[PDB]
Ligand binder design. Structure first.
Ligand SMILES: O=C(O)/C=C/c1ccc(O)cc1
Lengths: 121, 121
């Protein structure tokens, strides 16, 4: 759920997840996808395309088990859809930390309705 | 549109609109309505109910004219829908400012999917 996803982002980046990524660019946080504004945004683009391959679990609300082991996100047992979901979330947290170097606060509270339409996944 | 709405909120409250109200509680900013968390939140509840009659225009994207005269929001002429849209936005900016006394940051980046369902408008 948003709880695990947020903890993952905090653990990787060291940043307040909701504040830094809750409404970043055309793709991070609420709502769907748009043409990515930069690398950070594109992380969330991939992230939401990852969600489209899931098989019925709720990416926003379904809790799952994972652990922070040797400073690594390790997706726990769960069921297959939750496992894939946890992997989607792990991938975007890692990607957001990797791209901290081009993080732009001007995209932080982006007016997503004016975003250009995204290509299909 | 969001440009006018954001400027009204900034002028009345003195606060960064996107940051303080873009995701506040169950009702302010992105997405729809939910059971209000407080008075600030309930402003945005009334706000979005005010929007439900505006089926003739787009509250997020349609621009309109208004001026800031004598520290007052004055809606410009416009057509019936845009005028009403302007008055919705003026009323929430005022309400948000009037309720600054109980603004709570714990609701600033509220996880809206876990919000309880709202009463019908
Ligand atoms: O970074 C933040 O979350 C908030 C900064 C902030 C700035 C002015 C305020 O009145 C409240 C919070």
């Amino acid at each position: 759920s948003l709880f695990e996803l947020g903890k993952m982002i905090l653990q990787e980046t060291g940043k307040n997840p909701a504040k830094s990524y809750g409404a970043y660019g055309c793709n991070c946080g609420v709502l769907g996808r748009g043409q990515p504004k930069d690398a950070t945004d594109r992380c969330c683009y991939v992230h939401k395309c990852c969600y489209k391959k899931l098989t019925g679990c709720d990416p926003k609300k379904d809790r799952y088990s994972y652990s922070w082991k040797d400073k690594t996100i390790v997706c726990g047992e769960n069921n297959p859809c939750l496992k894939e979901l946890c992997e989607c979330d792990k991938a975007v947290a890692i990607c957001l930390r990797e791209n901290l170097g081009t993080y732009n606060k001007k995209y932080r509270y982006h007016l997503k309705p004016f975003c250009k339409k995204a290509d299909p996944c």
